[PDB]
Amino acid sequence: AFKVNQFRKTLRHVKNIVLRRKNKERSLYDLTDKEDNVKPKTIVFESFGGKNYSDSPKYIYEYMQKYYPNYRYIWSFKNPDKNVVPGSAEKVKRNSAEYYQAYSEASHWVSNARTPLYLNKKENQTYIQTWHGTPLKRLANDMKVVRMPGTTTPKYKRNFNRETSRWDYLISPNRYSTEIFRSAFWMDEERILEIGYPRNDVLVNRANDQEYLDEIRTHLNLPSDKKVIMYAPTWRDDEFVYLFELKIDLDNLYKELGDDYVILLRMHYLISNALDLSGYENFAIDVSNYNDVSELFLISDCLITDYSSVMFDYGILKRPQFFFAYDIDKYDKGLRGFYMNYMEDLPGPIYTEPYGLAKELKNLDKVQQQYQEKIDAFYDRFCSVDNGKASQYIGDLIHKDIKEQLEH
Amino acid sequence: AFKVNQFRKTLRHVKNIVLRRKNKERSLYDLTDKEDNVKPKTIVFESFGGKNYSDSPKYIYEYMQKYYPNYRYIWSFKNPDKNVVPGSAEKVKRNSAEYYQAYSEASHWVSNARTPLYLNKKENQTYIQTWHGTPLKRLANDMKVVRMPGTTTPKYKRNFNRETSRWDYLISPNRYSTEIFRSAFWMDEERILEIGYPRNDVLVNRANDQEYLDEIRTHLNLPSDKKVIMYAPTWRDDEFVSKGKYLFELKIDLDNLYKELGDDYVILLRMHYLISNALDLSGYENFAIDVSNYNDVSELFLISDCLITDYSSVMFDYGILKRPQFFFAYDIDKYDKGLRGFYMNYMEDLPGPIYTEPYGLAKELKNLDKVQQQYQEKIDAFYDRFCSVDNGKASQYIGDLIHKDIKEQLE
Amino acid sequence: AFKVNQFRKTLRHVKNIVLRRKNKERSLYDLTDKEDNVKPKTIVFESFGGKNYSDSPKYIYEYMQKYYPNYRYIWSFKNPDKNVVPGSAEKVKRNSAEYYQAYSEASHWVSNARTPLYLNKKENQTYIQTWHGTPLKRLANDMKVVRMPGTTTPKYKRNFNRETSRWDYLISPNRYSTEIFRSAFWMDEERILEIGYPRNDVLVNRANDQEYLDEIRTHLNLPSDKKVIMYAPTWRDDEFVSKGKYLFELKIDLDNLYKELGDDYVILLRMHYLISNALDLSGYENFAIDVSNYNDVSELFLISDCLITDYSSVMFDYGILKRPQFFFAYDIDKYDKGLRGFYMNYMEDLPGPIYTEPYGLAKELKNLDKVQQQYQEKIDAFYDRFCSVDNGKASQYIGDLIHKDIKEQLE
Amino acid sequence: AFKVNQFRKTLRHVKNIVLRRKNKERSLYDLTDKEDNVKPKTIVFESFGGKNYSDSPKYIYEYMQKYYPNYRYIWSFKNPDKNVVPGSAEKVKRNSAEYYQAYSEASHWVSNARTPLYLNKKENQTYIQTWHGTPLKRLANDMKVVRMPGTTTPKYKRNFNRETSRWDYLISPNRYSTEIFRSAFWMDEERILEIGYPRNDVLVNRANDQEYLDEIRTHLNLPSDKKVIMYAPTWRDDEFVSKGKYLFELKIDLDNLYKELGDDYVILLRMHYLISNALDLSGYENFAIDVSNYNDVSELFLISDCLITDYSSVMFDYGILKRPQFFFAYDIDKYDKGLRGFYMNYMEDLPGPIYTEPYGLAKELKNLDKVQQQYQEKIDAFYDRFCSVDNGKASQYIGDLIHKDIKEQLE
Ligand SMILES: [Cl-]
Ligand SMILES: [Cl-]
Ligand SMILES: [Cl-]
Ligand SMILES: [Cl-]
Ligand SMILES: [Cl-]
Ligand SMILES: [Cl-]
Ligand SMILES: [Cl-]
Ligand SMILES: [Cl-]
Ligand SMILES: [Cl-]
Ligand SMILES: [Cl-]
Ligand SMILES: [Cl-]
Ligand SMILES: [Cl-]
Ligand SMILES: [Cl-]
Ligand SMILES: [Cl-]
Ligand SMILES: [Cl-]
Ligand SMILES: [Cl-]
Ligand SMILES: [Cl-]
Ligand SMILES: [Cl-]
Ligand SMILES: [Cl-]
Ligand SMILES: [Cl-]
Ligand SMILES: [Cl-]
Ligand SMILES: [Cl-]
Ligand SMILES: [Cl-]
Ligand SMILES: [Cl-]
Ligand SMILES: [Cl-]
Ligand SMILES: [Cl-]
Questions:
Q1: Which UniProt keywords apply (chains B, C, D)?
Q2: What is the bridge-based pairing of β-strands C106-111 and C90-93?
Q3: Which of A89, B401, D333, D354 has CA atoms 20 to 30 A from the CA of B80?
């Protein structure tokens, strides 16, 4: 009856304690984690590996505060002090003793991204994976190569699969996605919940509430008379080398669109602190660090992107979208590296140059009519499922889970 | 579920290993010892905590070598390279990696003294305890005080009890000892084997093997025409003085003995090791022979014409030969006056005279025939009580038990 | 790069953390206890190992509260929520994180009994020992035997020796105590402050404060016209029986006392706590009051017209008042015939008569003044020998000593 | 008192011991490996990771046997029982106690391929790397990508680089390989020994020893009146199918070759091991001889009138003989088209023609003498650029270097 796994965790924990390693917190938790540590009314939330108080976990958590305020709520953050969380939740810092206590104790884990494999998901706890968008580029199991530092394509997939098996529930936005998850994530369909993303709830429920639209606008200090264009290009390793002004030509957009529009730039953080918008105030508004992207969609009159899954979220609003695929050349030529037919059925025009994009923008209603058919077809395939009830569904499922647990 | 006893062991072993402690061998052993390390045909032996190749475990071993070569024999010593073992047995050194293996693998343990409590006797293993004498002085449970340093009487007894509980079998010499052992050792009688001491088999089987008697006599350069007195006093603490550089001459007075008996007798001094290498026998050569470091005490009984002792369990072993015995209790005052710190009534029923002074003793030794005649009935009765059990078949009974035990296992 | 002493502490703490041992608070403390933790203006107090807010630590503290309000005062108790401390002090529970902090952080330890060896008295810190009374019974080095379960006299003295070696200051009531301490506690005279007990201050400064005497008196609900006997016998194992449910009545004879003195006197019974809550005093209301739980014993002396005791260090305290004492040694024969297990000559030089029967004692009490006269000579001798030192200034001496120590550190 | 790295090893060894891992041999070695263990006259040989007794290390060893019979020579093998070693050397099995002793003790390591990074090449030891051939395919540093399971292109390169930094000496066959090694292996020219390969010594010294050419031939049961063609295609992943049971007959068309070359030739097939056990040479007996398992590839060369190959560094060894070579690249079009995945221009500067179909190859073979003359100019250029550096004295150079090293070390 020699417990060989126990013996390994002890050696490791002793090594950590003695060498003064920071992982001592982790090895202790690993030694001592029992099924018995779990309390049914403790729930943990984490989004994007602990960077933010945001999207789907945020809305799940906000719904649960309104209707079930007596459970113990915990949020996990890389830096708790820099994140404001409303309500009763306590914040824990990643990799701190309280972090491990929290995950050891919680009966439910809620998140939208992968959680670390050194955390143990007991048969005793329920891991709810919201994920973070309808896939466009291939991922997980569906990938061909991944020359990603430190890891082989197989060892990376081995690991991804290890994580997904721990997923008890996995939220889905659309049939297309479920079909994809089933393959890509190794998921059994039983475990999939095609209920839409909680983070898209506002896109259905609050799209007309003007007092709310007007709050979002003045918090960003937007001009009262101008329409809002949002630009959210994906990150490209290519363009890293003071950055060369955006490809989309701000100078030109200003001359072309300044009298009618303000444009919201949503860049990667690294592009955001290189961007110098002197000369563009009241026209070009850095919005990279804004906490809630769903609120940005709500106040946005059209959306420019290239190859991001945000197009599917935003498409719920049936507003116009443009695709500035300036580098579409480089991206594989006849790119089947995407799950869907990009050159054909997206809700808007593909421009490879920004100058004709600008003119087109000059009159939105023409575009809205011209791609109405294409917009609707897109709404019907990818958005024909968001009720606006998604936070309620998870929220209620968790409640009902933890009642059965407070009984036998 | 968390296995806490293992975790404690693991921590202990890590500590010893990092700190360069000698007991790392012990903690590795303790950590990994499983009921599965045990091989039925492996048998360990030690006597007197590994001082000797000797006593009852010696004779159990030499029996099994003759009729049971097939098995794996191990002997444990403090210093293996200083001990000669006949036959096939391997010899491990105490506290060494091989010592713990041996004790981990063995299905039988055979010894005559207490084995350490840090060794684990598994439900899997049979611990056979021969012990080492019919008791005279009250031991273990029956003691009243043990002002032994660092330890209290309760804790010393607690430890002794932990030990005897591990004894699967316990050898007994006579009904007297069985009663005593049942009490002092906390023994179940089911577990006591009244068979005699394997180490006293030769006192039954060989008293008259003249050629065997003579090997012994010549090994000790004993002069041919002389009778043989053995003197074996227990150790007295009162007597230790001066770093033990020089001891006052023995109270039995060798000088007087040489004058009185020097022509007819030779005298073998069996002393404690401290007295022995302090003894100066200059001027008593071929009369007084130090025999303290002699391997086999039984062999010395066989060639002895009488025994002189005071308070030792040896009187009980020698009693088998029915020869004369003298009790030189010079210090009997000191010993409590009318002391019942002795299981038997020392004052009434020993097989011989109590002499508090050595000169009367010497005169008596002049005529040995007269002493035999004089105390024959006291000798005969002492034989009937404490020595009427040895068939000289004890070594045999134990060996056959071991062999029968391991046959069952081999299925 | 890793020291062995830390590695040992480190392993122990892992053990306690994972095993959920309650000593986890202690292994953590043993780990992080650095000389740098010491805040010069922090002081800890504890009397009788934290049973109480009382005795000499209490008075050292009350004096410092008045004259040095701005230090961090900490009191340690077994059960802090059942203790009432006046002033600015915060209180900690034994063996809690705060307990260990306080002791790590303090520049000064103040107490009247041995404090645990797992606490670390660093070079940095000053440990002031007040002890708790002039010895009558032999203690520490001076005891001959200590048959106290689980330990040995040598290991008990070793440990006691360890504790006193950490006492930077030791208070002394008299030269007799000093001379005894220099031997019994392995102390240098250089470390003894012969200044008297802080707890005794009130006996010197307040015996004539009638308002104070009135508080104490009306607090106990004592009759107004009646004088006051106090009775405080030492504990005796010989008398504990029946799980302690019902005791045999006091050998002093309350009935007789009640008949003989019940109109002139009231008697305060100060008994061991086990005896106190077994005594049924029904029938003696307003005559014999149980006073065994009273917080403060010096106050009980102040209002007492005489003391009745037997073998107790209290006689040396009460003696400051130069009042009649009596000594009801009813078992005085049991106590060793000519027992020199006392430092003083009990049979002779004590302040009052020895009575073995209660009844002569009763008659004697009838007229206190006559007793004060007969023994005025002896009371004076006793006051000269044991009580002459008390300035009423003891708490001042300690409080100012501490104050002078922390002014230096403040650089 | 305890250093950090020793702790890490210590704990790793605990894990191996308790958990009965085979790697315990290794963890012990890591703990006990001291710069002191080294014995100046102990020298250790391994070739191709221990699969063989063979190429350069063999010849370095055979030379030092003849001339320095009095050193401790050790050879390392995966399975020592299956390898015959001439002379005095003792054998060791990889990952055994003896194996780790050998590398710890040796003042010199001789090898022809990467040795494991868990072995400690001390500042005390000299690690001579001969490697195993002039490159054609890019290696190490110069590889662009390597999607080879279990490792990443950067991790692969770090590990490789870690290993070559351990090389004190590295043998080069030619300047060409030197300009290459310098980059691919991160070498300092100071450490490269351009002497030629010892395995190629016989290519110079014995190309005429008929008694010797004959022994090889009569070992292989080769016909008397027939010339020898050798074929040595590199392994190709593509061609392995169906569990590797039945292969598709060689692309070279053996039936054709028989018809064409039979009455004058015999063809030595040197394939991958996996192909050798798949080839059914039934009915080609005495024409096509499987030579895949033959221990010495240079003996194979010495007796060959020409060599058919495709992409292999053996063309550079054969080149020393200035004999005709053919390049049967039936899949040259698969290989990158115009691939510079090669360090030389294949299409241009090799010593024979490139054929893509085997039928012209065969016709050409029919008249060796026309080919030798028609291509002499190319064969001589090849020999100059790649083969003009072997004096036949490489083995003696490396032997004499080791010797010089260990005369000094002897002090
Ligand atoms: Cl709960
Ligand atoms: Cl923080
Ligand atoms: Cl975004
Ligand atoms: Cl463990
Ligand atoms: Cl076996
Ligand atoms: Cl030895
Ligand atoms: Cl031997
Ligand atoms: Cl003598
Ligand atoms: Cl003996
Ligand atoms: Cl270090
Ligand atoms: Cl140290
Ligand atoms: Cl502890
Ligand atoms: Cl301070
Ligand atoms: Cl102050
Ligand atoms: Cl409390
Ligand atoms: Cl105390
Ligand atoms: Cl201390
Ligand atoms: Cl006292
Ligand atoms: Cl103690
Ligand atoms: Cl005095
Ligand atoms: Cl009473
Ligand atoms: Cl290892
Ligand atoms: Cl050497
Ligand atoms: Cl082998
Ligand atoms: Cl190395
Ligand atoms: Cl070249």
A1: Cell membrane, Cell wall biogenesis/degradation, Membrane, Teichoic acid biosynthesis, Transferase
A2: unpaired
A3: B401
Residue C56 region by backbone torsions, left for phi larger than 0, else alpha for psi between -120 and 50, else beta: alpha
D96 and D214 share one domain: no
- Residue D126 pairs with which residues in a beta bridge? D108
The answer on B231 and B203 residing in a single domain is no
If interface means Cβ-Cβ distance under 8 Å, which residues of chain A face chain B?
1-3, 6-7, 10-11, 14, 32, 34
Are A198 and A251 members of one domain?
no
CB–CB of C19 and B7 under 8 A?
yes
Residue A7 has what DSSP assignment?
H
Dihedral (CA of A46, A48, A54, A58) sign: negative
Question: How many contiguous H segments (helices) and E segments (strands) does chain C have?
Answer: 16, 13
Within this chain, do residues C256 and C370 fall inside the same structural domain, yes or no? yes
Q: ∠ CA(B70), CA(B75), CA(B81), 5° rounding?
A: 125
Task: Give residue D95 CA to ligand 23 midpoint distance, Å.
Answer: 23
Task: Tell me the pairing of strands C39-46 and C106-111.
Answer: parallel
Q: At what angle do helices A24-32 and C4-19 cross, to 10 degrees?
A: 40
* Count helices and strands in chain A by DSSP H and E runs: 16, 13
Q: Which two tokens stand for residue D43?
A: 């020298």
Which residues form the domain of B82?
3-207+391-411
Q: CA B56, CA B397: separation in Å to the nearest integer?
A: 12
What CATH number is attached to the domain comprising C121? 3.40.50.11820
**Chain B partners of A1 at a C-beta cutoff of 8 Å?**
3
Neighbours of C79 (CB within 10 A): 11
B41 CA → ligand 5 middle, Å: 4
Q: Which residue has the tokens 């490159």?
A: D135
In chain B, the number of structural domains is: 2
User: Any idea which residue has 């207490």 for tokens?
Assistant: B114
Q: Structure resolution in Å?
A: 2.7
Q: Are residues B152 and B101 in the same domain?
A: yes
Cα D271 from Cα D197, distance rounded (Å): 23
Residues of A with CB under 8 A from a CB of D: 4, 7-8, 11, 14-15, 18-19, 145, 147, 149-155
For residue D356, give the nearest of D396, D329, D327 by alpha carbon: D329
Find the closest chain C residue to B19 by CA distance: C4
- Contact at CB, B152 and C150, closer than 8 angstroms: yes
CATH code of C309's domain: 3.40.50.12580
Residue D216: CB atoms within 10 Å: 18
Residues of chain C with a CB closer than 8 angstroms to some CB in chain D: 1-4, 7
- Which residues crowd ion ligand 14, with CB under 5 Å? C 68, 70
DSSP C217-280: HHHTT--SS-EEEEEEPPP-GGG--GGGSSPPPPTT-HHHHHHHHTTTEEEEE---HHHHTT--
If one counts every other C-beta atom within 10 angstroms of the C-beta of residue B223, the result is 10
Experimental method: X-ray
Q: Which residues of C touch B9 (CB under 8 A)?
A: none
Name A170's Cβ contacts closer than 8 Å, sequence gap at least 6: A129, A131, A164, A181, A185, A187, A191, A192, A193
Q: What is the Cα–Cα distance from D284 to D279, expressed in whole angstroms?
A: 11
Distance CA C234, CA C309 (A): 8
User: Dmax of chain A from CA atoms?
Assistant: 79
Do D43 and D172 lie in one domain? The reply is yes
Q: Are C245 and C215 in contact (CB under 8 A)?
A: no
Closest CA to A112 of A390, A400, A401, A408: A390
Q: What residue spans of C22-96 are helical by DSSP H? A: 24-32, 55-67
State whether D11 and B13 contact (CB < 8 Å): no
| A387 close to A196: Cβ distance less than 8 angstroms | yes
**Contact assignment for A11 to D15 by CB distance below 8 Å:** yes
Q: Which two tokens stand for residue D95?
A: 């990952």
